[PDB]
Amino acid sequence: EPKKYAVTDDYQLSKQVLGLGVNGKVLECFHRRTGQKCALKLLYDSPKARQEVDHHWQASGGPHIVCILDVYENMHHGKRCLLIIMECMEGGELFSRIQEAFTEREAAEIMRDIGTAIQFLHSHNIAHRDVKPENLLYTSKEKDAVLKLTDFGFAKETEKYDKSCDMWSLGVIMYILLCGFPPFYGFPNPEWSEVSEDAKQLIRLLLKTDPTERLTITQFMNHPWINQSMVVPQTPLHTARVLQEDKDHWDEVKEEMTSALATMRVDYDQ
Numbered sequence: 001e002p003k004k005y006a007v008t009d010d011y012q013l014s015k016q017v018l019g020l021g022v023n024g025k026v027l028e029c030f031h032r033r034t035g036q037k038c039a040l041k042l043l044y045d046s047p048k049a050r051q052e053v054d055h056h057w058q059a060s061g062g063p064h065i066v067c068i069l070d071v072y073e074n075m076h077h078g079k080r081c082l083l084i085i086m087e088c089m090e091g092g093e094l095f096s097r098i099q100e101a102f103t104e105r106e107a108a109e110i111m112r113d114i115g116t117a118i119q120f121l122h123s124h125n126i127a128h129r130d131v132k133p134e135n136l137l138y139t140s141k142e143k144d145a146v147l148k149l150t151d152f153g154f155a156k157e158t159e160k161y162d163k164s165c166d167m168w169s170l171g172v173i174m175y176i177l178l179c180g181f182p183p184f185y186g187f188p189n190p191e192w193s194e195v196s197e198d199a200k201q202l203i204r205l206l207l208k209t210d211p212t213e214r215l216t217i218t219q220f221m222n223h224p225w226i227n228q229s230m231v232v233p234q235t236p237l238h239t240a241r242v243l244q245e246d247k248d249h250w251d252e253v254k255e256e257m258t259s260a261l262a263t264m265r266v267d268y269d270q
């Protein structure tokens with residue numbers, strides 16, 4: 001099912017880059033028959049790159065996951081390559097949309113969306129292991145846009161530990177959603193003043209230092225704040241203001257979280 005004829009027979013490539021995904025750069029392209037703009041991820045062929053395509057195909061179809069359209073096995077400047085054609089997510093990154101009222105109920109909606117995605121993967125015994133702001137994208141800039149998760153370059157077919165790393169990521173994203181800075185912890189006033197006890201409780205249960213004590217996705221999804229996301233108070237939050245105000249170290253917090261996820265993927269630590 002990976003197509004072996006040239007990707008450029010089906011797609012018109014452009015020289016616009018969306019971003020760097022560890023294995024490969026991401027480029028815009030256009031399907032030739034339809035007009036649709038799509039995203040193309042170039043991976044040099046390796047066991048790891050083959051695992052990514054495998055894990056992404058398996059995940060593709062689930063809720064709130066960026067869909068694969070085609071996969072090509074091509075030669076490119078004398079090197080063997082896998083090209084993942086994905087749907088183009090032109091809404092941009094989760095937290096960029098947010099810094100562009102933002103209530104606690106809206107945050108619950110978002111975390112529920114991300115949770116459904118992780119529920120799908122985990123029930124299919126796939127741990128993502130790289131859930132972080134720049135891997136959470138919107139399909140469009142419109143109001144009806146759908147939040148989706150990409151980047152299976154660190155995904156692993158499962159175990160309880162690898163899954164618990166995803167649940168830690170949910171806690172960190174939820175924390176930043178609720179106030180605008182990461183837990184690098186406590187809940188400092190005045191940002192955490194009118195945030196509900198259920199929100200803080202859920203985050204405590206996810207940010208547990210001991211992975212065994214950490215909530216499972218199925219417990220995450222059954223928590224009132226997620227399960228009853230539609231009756232969470234419409235309480236206005238500081239996040240949008242805080243993000244714009246602290247825009248000059250957003251690259252730092254992204255770098256810090258990438259670093260934290262990296263150390264959780266190590267065989268031995270301390």
Ligand SMILES: O=C(Nc1cc(-c2cc3c([nH]2)[C@]2(CCCNC2)CNC3=O)ccn1)c1cccc(C(F)(F)F)c1
Pocket residue numbers: 018019020021022026039041066086087088089090091092093134135137150151152
């Ligand atoms: O990135 C966009 N569309 C997009 C992007 C991806 C994508 C996949 C991967 C990544 N992006 C990254 C880029 C560097 C940051 N990490 C994630 C590395 N690894 C991936 O696996 C997939 C599908 N559509 C986009 C397109 C048009 C406009 C806009 C914007 F909203 F910025 F105006 C964004």
